[PDB]
Design a protein around this ligand. Sequence first.
Ligand code: NAG
Ligand code: NAG
Length: 148
Amino acid sequence: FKVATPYSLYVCPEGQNVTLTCRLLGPVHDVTFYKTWYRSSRGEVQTCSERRPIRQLTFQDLHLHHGGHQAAQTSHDLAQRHGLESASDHHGNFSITMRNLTLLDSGLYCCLVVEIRHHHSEHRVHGAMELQVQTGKDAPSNCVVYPS
Ligand SMILES: *[C@@H]1O[C@H](CO)[C@@H](O)[C@H](O)[C@H]1NC(C)=O
Ligand SMILES: *[C@@H]1O[C@H](CO)[C@@H](O)[C@H](O)[C@H]1NC(C)=O
C-alpha cells in the first residue's frame, strides 16, 4: 500500500485546532500496524528521515500499535496534557489533532505506517505535509488547506 496525503499545506492562525490526515491507499488477523507522527524536514535525497518532537513529545510517545481488525486512539492523558490526539480508524484514515495552536507548532509533519506480520516488516511508508501557524494581521480566520 501507499500513503496518500490529501493536503500538503495547512495554514492556521494561532489558537485554532487542526487535524492533519494521512490515508492508506491500495491493498491493506495476525497482522499489526505501527503508526506514529513526528516533525522532520525535506532533505536533499531524504524526506521524513530524521524524527523531531511534536510539542516536546517524540514519535515513541505518540505511536499507536494495533491489529488489522482494530481502530486505536492515543490516551486521554496525552490529550489533556499536551493537546494532541492521534487516531486510526478501520478504513485507512490516520490523523493527529492538535489543540490550541501556537507559532512553535509550525513545521513539516510526517505520518509513518509500518505493517508487521510475524515480527517481519513488510511495508514501511510515510507521508509529509507542512503546517504553518500564522500570527497577526494576515493570518486567516481559521485553517486554510491546500491539496497536494
Ligand atoms: C478546540 O478543541 C477544544 C476541545 O479539546 C474545544 O474546547 C475548543 O473550543 C476548540 N477551539 C476552537 C477554536 O474551535
Ligand atoms: C486550550 O485553551 C483553552 C482556552 O481557550 C483552555 O480552556 C483549554 O483547556 C486548552 N486546552 C489544552 C489542551 O491546553
